[PDB]
Nucleic acid binder design. Structure first.
Length: 59
DNA sequence: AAAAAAAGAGTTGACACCCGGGCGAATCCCTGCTATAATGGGAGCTGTCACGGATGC
């Protein structure tokens, strides 16, 4: 009863939902790429590159 | 009238062996990934009363 009294169906609504999810992921990625918090934090792992353990195929 | 040894103890090397702990190897359990379109559910009484109590205007 609860699922039927509040839910519906949408053919093209799934496309809009996917576009909204993609926009949210894009905005989150744009907001997470900052300076002195994420660049220097992840750079300590990028400096470990050259051994092929987690620098390539992992990060 | 005397006087020493098969047992009885006591060990000393000499195997026979019997589960324990590793070294392997062979093999179980988990977990996730599959891209045409899938869009609200199946029994069950209903052939006992009667009492004793719990809601309602």
């Amino acid at each position: 009863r609860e699922m039927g009294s509040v839910e519906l169906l949408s053919r093209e609504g799934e496309i809009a939902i996917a576009k909204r999810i993609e926009a949210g992921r894009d905005t989150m990625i744009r907001g997470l790429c900052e300076s002195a918090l994420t660049f220097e934090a992840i750079m300590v792992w990028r400096e470990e590159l050259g051994t092929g353990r987690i620098l390539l195929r992992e990060v």
